[PDB]
Design a protein around this ligand. Structure first.
Ligand code: SF4
Ligand code: H2S
Length: 155
C-alpha cells in the first residue's frame, strides 16, 4: 500500500533546528509525498522537551551533552522513544532523518569533542529506530528511500 514515512521536521523547512534555522530540502518527490499526507514531520529534540533555540549538543557514547557540560540525554532519549511510538502507532517502517545530528544522524555525527570533527556513527533516534527494525535514510539517500517506499506500493 501507499505507506507513510517519518521525516525530521527541519528537512520539511520547519524552524526547529538548534539555531532556529531550517534544513528544508529541494525535492519534488518529498513535496509530492507531503502533498499526499504521507510524510509525518517529527523533531525528536522538540518532542523531548528542548527549546528552540538550544545549545549545540554532541553524543559522548550513551550520553548527550552541551559544550558547557549540561547533560541532555533525558530529553534526547524521550524524543527517540516518542519517534518510535509514532512509527509503531502509524505502521511506519521508513524514516528520512537529518544527517550529522546527535538525534537524527545516520551515517555521521560529531565526535563529542566540540571541535567540528565528524566521525562514523548515528544519532539517538536513528539508533533506536534501527534497533526496532525501521530503516533510516538521510537526505543524501533520497533515491534509495524513494525506491524502498515504491517497492511495497501495490501490495
Ligand atoms: S532533532 Fe532532528 S528533526 Fe529536530 S531540528 Fe535537529 S536534526 Fe532536525
Ligand atoms: S537540531
Amino acid at each position: 500500500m501507499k505507506e507513510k514515512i517519518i521525516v525530521s521536521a527541519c528537512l520539511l523547512g520547519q524552524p526547529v533546528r538548534y539555531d532556529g534555522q531550517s534544513k528544508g530540502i529541494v525535492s519534488n518527490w518529498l513535496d509530492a509525498l507531503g502533498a499526499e499526507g504521507r510524510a509525518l514531520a517529527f523533531c525528536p529534540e522538540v518532542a523531548g522537551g528542548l527549546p528552540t533555540p538550544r545549545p549545540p549538543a554532541e553524543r559522548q557514547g550513551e550520553h548527550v551533552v552541551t559544550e558547557s557540560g549540561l547533560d541532555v540525554t533525558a530529553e534526547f532519549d524521550r524524543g527517540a522513544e516518542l519517534a518510535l511510538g509514532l512509527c509503531l502507532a502509524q505502521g511506519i517502517r521508513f524514516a528520512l532523518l537529518k544527517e550529522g545530528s546527535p538525534s537524527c544522524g545516520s551515517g555521521r555525527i560529531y565526535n563529542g569533542r566540540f571541535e567540528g570533527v565528524s566521525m562514523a556513527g548515528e544519532g539517538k533516534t536513528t539508533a533506536l529506530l534501527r534497533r526496532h527494525g525501521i530503516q533510516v535514510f538521510s537526505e543524501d539517500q533520497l533515491p534509495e528511500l524513494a525506491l524502498a517506499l515504491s517497492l511495497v506500493a501495490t501490495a
